[PDB]
From Swiss-Prot, chain A:
Oligomer status and interactors: Component of the mitochondrial small ribosomal subunit (mt-SSU). Mature mammalian 55S mitochondrial ribosomes consist of a small (28S) and a large (39S) subunit. The 28S small subunit contains a 12S ribosomal RNA (12S mt-rRNA) and 30 different proteins. The 39S large subunit contains a 16S rRNA (16S mt-rRNA), a copy of mitochondrial valine transfer RNA (mt-tRNA(Val)), which plays an integral structural role, and 52 different proteins.
Taxonomic lineage: Eukaryota, Metazoa, Chordata, Craniata, Vertebrata
Protein name as it appears in the record: Small ribosomal subunit protein uS9m
Compartments (UniProt record): Mitochondrion
N6-acetyllysine found at: 84
Stretch list, region Disordered: 171-192
Family per record: Belongs to the universal ribosomal protein uS9 family.
Shown segment, full-protein numbering: 199 to 395 of 396
Organism field: Homo sapiens
UniProtKB/Swiss-Prot annotation, chain C:
Subcellular location: Mitochondrion
Organism: Homo sapiens
Name of encoding gene: MRPS2
Disease linkage: Combined oxidative phosphorylation deficiency 36: An autosomal recessive, multisystem disease resulting from deficiencies of mitochondrial respiratory enzyme complexes and mitochondrial dysfunction. Clinical manifestations include sensorineural hearing impairment, mild developmental delay, hypoglycemia, and intellectual disability.
Family classification: Belongs to the universal ribosomal protein uS2 family.
Record's subunit section: Component of the mitochondrial small ribosomal subunit (mt-SSU). Mature mammalian 55S mitochondrial ribosomes consist of a small (28S) and a large (39S) subunit. The 28S small subunit contains a 12S ribosomal RNA (12S mt-rRNA) and 30 different proteins. The 39S large subunit contains a 16S rRNA (16S mt-rRNA), a copy of mitochondrial valine transfer RNA (mt-tRNA(Val)), which plays an integral structural role, and 52 different proteins.
Parent sequence residues shown: 199 to 274 of 296
Purpose of the protein: Required for mitoribosome formation and stability, and mitochondrial translation.
Protein name: Small ribosomal subunit protein uS2m
Curated annotation (Swiss-Prot), chain D:
Name recorded for this polypeptide: Small ribosomal subunit protein uS7m
Entry's Gene Ontology molecular function annotations: mRNA binding; RNA binding; rRNA binding; structural constituent of ribosome
Subunit description: Component of the mitochondrial small ribosomal subunit (mt-SSU), essential for mitochondrial protein synthesis. Mature mammalian 55S mitochondrial ribosomes consist of a small (28S) and a large (39S) subunit. The 28S small subunit contains a 12S ribosomal RNA (12S mt-rRNA) and 30 different proteins. The 39S large subunit contains a 16S rRNA (16S mt-rRNA), a copy of mitochondrial valine transfer RNA (mt-tRNA(Val)), which plays an integral structural role, and 52 different proteins.
Record organism: Homo sapiens
Keywords of this entry: Acetylation, Disease variant, Mitochondrion, Primary mitochondrial disease, Ribonucleoprotein, Ribosomal protein, Transit peptide
Effect of residue 147 to V: In COXPD34; results in decreased mitochondrial protein synthesis and reduced levels of respiratory complexes; MRPS7 mRNA and protein levels are reduced
Superkingdom assignment: Eukaryota
UniProtKB/Swiss-Prot annotation, chain E:
Family: Belongs to the RbfA family.
Superkingdom classification of source: Eukaryota
Lineage of origin: Eukaryota, Metazoa, Chordata, Craniata, Vertebrata
Organism: Homo sapiens (Human)
Protein name as annotated: Putative ribosome-binding factor A, mitochondrial
Location within or outside the cell: Mitochondrion
Shown segment, full-protein numbering: 90 to 198 of 343
Amino acid sequence: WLIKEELEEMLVEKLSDLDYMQFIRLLEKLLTSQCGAAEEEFVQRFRRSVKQLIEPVQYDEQGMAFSKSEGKRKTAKAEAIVYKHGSGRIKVNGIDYQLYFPITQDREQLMFPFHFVDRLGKHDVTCTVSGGGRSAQAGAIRLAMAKALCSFVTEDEVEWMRQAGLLTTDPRVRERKKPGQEGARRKFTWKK
Amino acid sequence: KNRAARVRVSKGDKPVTYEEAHAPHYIAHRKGWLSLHTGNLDGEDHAAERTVEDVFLRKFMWGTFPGCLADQLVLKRRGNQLEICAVVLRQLSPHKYYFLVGYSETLLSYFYKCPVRLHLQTVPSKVVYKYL
Amino acid sequence: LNNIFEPHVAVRDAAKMNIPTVGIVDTNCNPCLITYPVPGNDDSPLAVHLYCRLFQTAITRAKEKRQQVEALYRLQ
Amino acid sequence: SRYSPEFKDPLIDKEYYRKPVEELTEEEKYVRELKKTQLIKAAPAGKTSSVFEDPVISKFTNMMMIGGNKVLARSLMIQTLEAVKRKQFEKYHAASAEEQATIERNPYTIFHQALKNCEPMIGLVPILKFYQVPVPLPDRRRRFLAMKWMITECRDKKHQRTLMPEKLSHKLLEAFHNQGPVIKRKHDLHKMAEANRALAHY
Amino acid sequence: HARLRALNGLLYKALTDLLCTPEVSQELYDLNVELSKVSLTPDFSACRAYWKTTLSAEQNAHMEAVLQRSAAHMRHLLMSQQTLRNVPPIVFVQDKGNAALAELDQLLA
RNA sequence: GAUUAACCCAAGUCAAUAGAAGCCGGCGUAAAGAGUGUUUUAGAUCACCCCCCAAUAAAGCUAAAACUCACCUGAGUUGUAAAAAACUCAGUUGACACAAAAUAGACUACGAAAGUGGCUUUAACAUAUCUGACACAAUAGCUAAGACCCAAACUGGGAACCCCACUAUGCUUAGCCCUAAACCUCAACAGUUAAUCAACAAAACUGCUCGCCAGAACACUACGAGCCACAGCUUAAAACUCAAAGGACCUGGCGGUGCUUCAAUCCCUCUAGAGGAGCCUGUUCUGUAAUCGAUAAACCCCGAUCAACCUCACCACCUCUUGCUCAGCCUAUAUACCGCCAUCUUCAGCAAACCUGAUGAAGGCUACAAAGUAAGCGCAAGUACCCACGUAAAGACGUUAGGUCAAGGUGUAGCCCAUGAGGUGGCAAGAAAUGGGCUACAUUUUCUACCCCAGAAAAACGAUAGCCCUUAUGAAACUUAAGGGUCGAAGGUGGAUUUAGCAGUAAACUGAGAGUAGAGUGCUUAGUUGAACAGGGCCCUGAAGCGCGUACAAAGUGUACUGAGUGCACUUGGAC
Ligand SMILES: [Mg+2]
Ligand SMILES: [Mg+2]
Ligand SMILES: [Mg+2]
Ligand SMILES: [Mg+2]
Ligand SMILES: [Mg+2]
């Protein structure tokens, strides 16, 4: 249903909570009363409705197919090109992934999407990352790789990844320090 | 309680204008700047002199047009010119208005070494934005 | 009578403002302040429909006669 | 939390997604359909779909963490696992055929059995009527208490210059065999509960 | 205060005697309520009767409802018996202290 | 009290006294319906139409329950919060009153009132078809004699109130006393429902008669008198004093008021810390010739984004006099203010202007809606940052005479050869406590390389402190900061206790900026790694509802003992 403010704007009138409840309950009864098309059309005037984009598969000069995508985490940005076919090589900033990320946690982050879709060793990846710390860079590269792999994995696989969280951009970012308190929430030691 | 640049509520008989009715936090959101110059911009200089000029000009005009200004005075600094825009009551005679305008123009121009223009817009009365 | 079996506040307010009130007063109503009381039954659906039809017909006839007389006056 | 209340925690379990539709109940079908519309939080960096993922061990690592050195925490945990396995291997090699059957060699099995042995059945809370009263412990509290007790015992200064991996491995084996100061601590808690039995009506 | 303690004892005995019979009500009597104790507020503004709870949640709720409904009648019965010339309002409070002992003994077993 | 001005009257004025003002009003709660009934003389027109329940006295009687006595058994019985004290007595059964009268009674009758609730019998419940002073009068009390189960003033014992025993007394007879919240607090009789009416109470009145009241207290008192037969009741004043007393209602305040809900969020629960040692730093006391303000939350690296001179307002000394200023004053007054803020507020209410109580103080709620609408302000909404999230921002009216006259302005106060102005020199210390911060006590550490695949240290860890030297700034370095050497101290996770945090948060680490010539471990700000609990309850805090009881802007009448309680009856002018 449209919210009470929506209904108030529709009726250019000022209602109350109980008025909205009465209207909504009457509408619900109208639904339950086998509302036909002639009535469902009127009802839908008060209803309110509540997928990852598949990037094009481009081709190189040699005709090898690939998909390019991008993603940002904290302050890091990553552009990932994933090839339709590959032996699992993942070169980051022209560097091998294991060398560039000396932390097995970051390696696991890189592996997460391809492991999830069971496509490890089936794609060669080139990831250019910039900015932020090591974990932010790992997250950005993971997001970019997942998005690029979407184009190559089936739609059901894409939906599964999105449900898992691979394909959802992280909204968690550092919260700015506030004046008069040490941290974003750390209130200075309460004097007495 | 914040006492800064706010008009406290009263019995409802206190008329107030746009500026007086808007508090500082709304600045740059609902109300603009009463002085528009480039001093405070990044990498520029002479912010202190722009501020001093603004204060002096505002006091000068307030003392020159007693009970005549119906709104605050808007200062613009294009190039090196100066533009003082005022809303004035239609209570003082036009001849006096013109003489004061010319005198202030010339005197301020000679004082600060830059052309100055005064632009008056007249109203029957101070524009009430609400009553408090 | 309001839903709590009390005289509708509108009756007293109309008396205050000096707006004449026709009113279908039941045996438990209070016709003291109704300008034109019509003792009758206010609960029978047939009675209420009869009242509504009568008033609708009266208003319609009054308006049509008003229009007819206005036209008669203006034509001449 | 920057996540709005609408966001739901992600579910990471391949089997849950591979389960056939037919085996699903109507309630499970409805839940699966509903989840298609909800918002899912981005996965935490800790847990994944690896077949070698142990939430108990991850929690113990997090508890053993100091100041955010998860790297050192994980190093210590894996080192303790390796040390326990090494000791079990030595015992197995030094044991006859019959004793070899009874000898365990899986570090995770020893780890979990020792923690279970160190879980306290009951714990004493202050009740007001304040009186320290024997009160049942929830399972989460029991597990948390076991983990904290093990970590504290390993952090006791009585161990002079001994490294955390060796200390933890020795304590884990002692608990696995139902011995050691952590088992003594659990027994002391139970004895206090028994002695305060009379005060339980409070 | 010794006076308060004596008042609590007398009220506990009187309330137990009251609940021994259907005098208050047959519905209340059938519930077989057992009183853990009686405590009078320091100012004599209220009398809390702590009654032992059973395991069944629906039974506990029904017993609480009946006790709340019959508290005033019980107060009147006491003041009529003259067990106390003045009796403050009676409040029935659930008692659950023995659950700790019960579940301890269950686990310890 | 004086001064000015004014007002009234005026050859008068106005202080005292006295008088003139005087009954058709009321009686439930304010004074007032006398405890009840009946006369005469009279008065009035209301005269003409017109069974029995519980009255009362007498006589007789008893079902249940008591006491006592009998046996039979038992050794304890009784007593209460729990014990004491007391009896050796206790249980069944049986006998058995001169005491009291379950159930009916959820009835509302009888009687004039008081009273009358076991059964039977006798006697019996006035009257005109009106009102109207000798006869009664509960409980209590007295006299003489009986009864005395039980209860019980008083007494005694036990630990006024509680328990035990017991007496007047409650009972019968024969006489006295005549008082009660003797109340339906509402006089008798007749009549009416016509237009309601201080308020509450038992809807409002009319006629008619008798009794009673004329502010409170003095005063249910004194004197006299009557009854007494001497310690009391009835009748009942005066003087002196006061401008009140009194009745019915409305609202705000208060608790040391409990039950139920609650709250990085009251306590526990998770993490990290403060207090234990050193150092930086602020404050208080001492000291100093020698700094103001801030002062529980809401002071205490605070005004200060900061003191070697300056700053500086302080002290010492010296100097100037229309003084930079058509002077000035950092001197009092924040308890005059503006200006800017704090606190609740980690609130959501504040609200003008309008529209029931028969137009009183006052009130304004019910959604299947019953007199509330409310502009505007605030929350909200909107906006910045990276979302639609969160944080920022905002946060009304009032609260603490909150702070700030030393940001500046200013009312008021005072100085003007000094309370103004200028120059030179100076403490800025520590018995002792305390606030905050930094560094540690180590092995998750020390150290290097590196920025996470290593080798040493490991009783050493551990000072940014102290000492010497040098460098940067600056006129001036013991003054500040920085670099080197030196020394390696206290301490081995910490007392009273206690602070903060719900997620990119805490914690840890590293940079940058403000301000200065220089100067912080201070402040501001950017970023990195980055978790744990989140569930219980309310003693403690606070916020609510349920509400209770306090009070300012059980109670009582009569009667008697004792020394305020108790005994008996009565009333609700209390609660359920
Ligand atoms: Mg009707
Ligand atoms: Mg007569
Ligand atoms: Mg008489
Ligand atoms: Mg008598
Ligand atoms: Mg006797």
